[PDB]
Ligand binder design. Structure first.
Ligand code: OGA
Ligand code: OGA
Ligand code: OGA
Ligand code: OGA
Ligand code: NI
Ligand code: NI
Ligand code: NI
Ligand code: NI
Lengths: 232, 232, 242, 237
């Protein structure tokens, strides 16, 4: 099971793997290890995956159930990761972006660290309304990762202007091209992204063409800040 | 001799042509027509090209005259170049992709208030030349935005206003739906209409050396909607 | 009769005028003249002026009905002017700010004029008033073009949240710039009258939790029109009456 | 000596004292106690002040050495502590001056913004090429209060890029210069303002057209700022 690097801070393709229920435990752990490090991983030539087969593979990794976002952060226990498969693609366009929120935190100056560490945001669908920290400690890897995205409505104890301004400041660093991967989809492609340490965005640049994408989301946990305080 | 669409607002790939001086006038008309329409065009497997053959080809288009920040080339100069012919000589093992943006579509998709603004707005480009923010393209006749990283300020506006407005325009230009991100492979050639485009390198390949052979053409002096030339 | 200027772009004090309901017609014109030119005018030592007398005086100018704002712009026919009298003031602080929106427009770069002339804003209270106003309205009397924004603004039509707030703050910065504002320190028995169709105003909460009371009388206004001559659109709620 | 308050966060007027070099220690201690507390203090009815008499009174406070919000000469490391400004020739109208309380500004920062500012450093320049790196928060030598340090001289913040510098700068300046945290003095003849430059910003207002305006100032010697952790400012040039 080889793992080719795609970008400096994010992205890695994986070859010599046939996804499915019949997978070797050691093979699954290497995928899990590659996922945590590279934040998003890709598998090409997976034309054997139907809905039932993709569900089986997701069962090994975890537990099954446009604008820059982390999936369903308005919820308290937002999902850990997702497995997305291309089934029907447009003849042009329809790529997807991913950002590394772990490297986003790491490359902050110390003042912006002090800021984000003690800053809390209100995530909502704009009626679920969760209060998340802007920096969560990743339970598995132990990395500190920024938590924001389009669901963010405001920051706690902070006015509209300051919330809006700081939000875009943080988003500017997260989405900065050097910290992102843009995947050109093809038939039989499968993406897996760690939702605890990523942000993603669909690109609506295929006009009025159809584009079906069968996703399988895994079960998530409640974030905690550097001090160890849960969301509310 | 076909040309296929890559994105809704930008990007095309021209397959079925060997780039060189031998190409007939009809072939150049296909390339030019695609280039003006699609703003950036790409060729695949141009292994025959070197420096001499590429320079000979570039001469058919016009007269041959870090970059990790959204820019139009040499806009600090008055008669900045029309288009460029960039070729992959040697690439990194991973990353080293390039972004493109359609500044013609950007203008066309402006609300009328912002059209009012940009048509009448002027920017100071430097590393000192006053360009208009909207210029009329001398072939297609399309109004296209002219900004980028070389802009220090806007004429009539102060530091705050200049920046705040500058961000607003660049947010629309560099919007992902208005961009193509090329993954360079050996023997790839990209040609972009520097008049009607904006581009950006991505330093997502650590300390790996990336050599790119560019041939930039002769360009004309901008004029705004009123036909006013760029002062110096 | 005397009209002392306070600032370059806004503000004027008017002495030798006892405000009342039996004021001379020519004296009302002198006041109205200054109010149009100086946008806000001030009167001192008006101890006799009670509530009953204030309403009578207000009836001469027109028809009787904290963050930078123009009063009740969530409504379509928002007031033309107001008459604020000081009845109870704190021991310190509690001043009020005014901004000249006619001069604000006048001193826009041509690009920002181009923008604002064609720009429209949604004003709302959150009762459920929602009104689309032109950002630049033509003043009926003076014929001057004046910026119409303020706290009641919610979004600009056609633009997204980021652009709206960005451009909103750019305009508000020019409107509320110190060189374009007056700051009145209230003394007992003072009166302020402002042209609401060519001003924004702001209370300053810099007197802690203290008592501050001032009775107001608001004059009925008209529905704004842009430079093209297009009336403001009403989404929800009715116009103001009486 | 009576000392009336002007605003809740800033400003105070002091009556019952004629400014001069022959003031009793007790009197000057009250004037300073007022200055420290209220940031800026005003002395009306001082039509008798000569330049020499102004310099005399200034010598009791310390050692004798523009239409944008600034702290005087923050491009220098040991920038002035306070100044005593006097009106000599005023316009027919306008010409007021603004003052902000940068001590109260810091205090009212949410916990996140304290984190930011406490660890943030700025480059102050004169655009002579005095270039200094100050902390965005300094501990005041006398009061012990933490005050925001910025103004027009700030070229950028250390660690942050151009966009982030400007954005965050403007966020701070908005909080500092918020009307609730400001005092706007209407200059009358024979008025004297005294502001604590270590705990304030100020701004001239060009709202007197092109009229003649003359102001005579006596600035006092100040110390080098030190952040919460206790690190002095660095002279780059
Ligand atoms: O790739 C895409 O189209 C984006 N997918 C998602 O946002 C998602 O699965 O939540
Ligand atoms: O392709 C790249 O890396 C960017 N090229 C340029 O900015 C250029 O040729 O001017
Ligand atoms: O003067 C003040 O304190 C503010 N008054 C108003 O906003 C008003 O009357 O609408
Ligand atoms: O009083 C003014 O207009 C401004 N004064 C100063 O900026 C100063 O004394 O440093
Ligand atoms: Ni998603
Ligand atoms: Ni370039
Ligand atoms: Ni009001
Ligand atoms: Ni000064």
């Amino acid at each position: 099971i080889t793992v080719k690097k795609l970008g400096s801070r994010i992205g890695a393709q994986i070859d010599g793997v046939r996804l499915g229920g019949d997978l070797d435990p050691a093979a699954v752990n290497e995928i899990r290890a590659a996922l945590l490090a590279h934040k998003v991983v890709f598998f090409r030539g997976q034309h054997q995956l139907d809905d039932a087969e993709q569900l089986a593979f997701a069962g090994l990794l975890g537990t099954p159930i446009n604008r820059w976002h982390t999936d369903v952060t308005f919820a308290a226990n937002y999902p850990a990761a997702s497995v997305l498969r291309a089934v029907s693609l447009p003849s042009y366009g329809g790529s997807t972006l991913w950002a590394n929120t772990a490297a986003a935190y790491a490359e902050l100056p110390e003042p912006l660290k002090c800021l984000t560490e003690n800053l809390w945001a209100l995530h909502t669908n704009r009626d679920f309304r969760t209060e998340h920290p802007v920096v969560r400690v990743h339970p598995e890897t132990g990395e500190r990762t920024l938590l924001a995205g389009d669901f963010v409505r405001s920051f706690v104890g902070l006015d509209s202007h300051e919330s809006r301004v700081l939000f875009e400041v943080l988003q500017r660093r997260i989405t900065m091209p050097e910290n992102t991967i843009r995947w050109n989809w093809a038939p039989g492609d499968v993406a897996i992204w760690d939702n605890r340490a990523t942000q993603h965005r669909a690109i609506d640049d295929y006009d009025d063409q159809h584009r079906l994408m069968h996703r399988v989301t895994l079960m998530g946990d409640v974030p905690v800040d550097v001090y160890g305080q849960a969301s509310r």
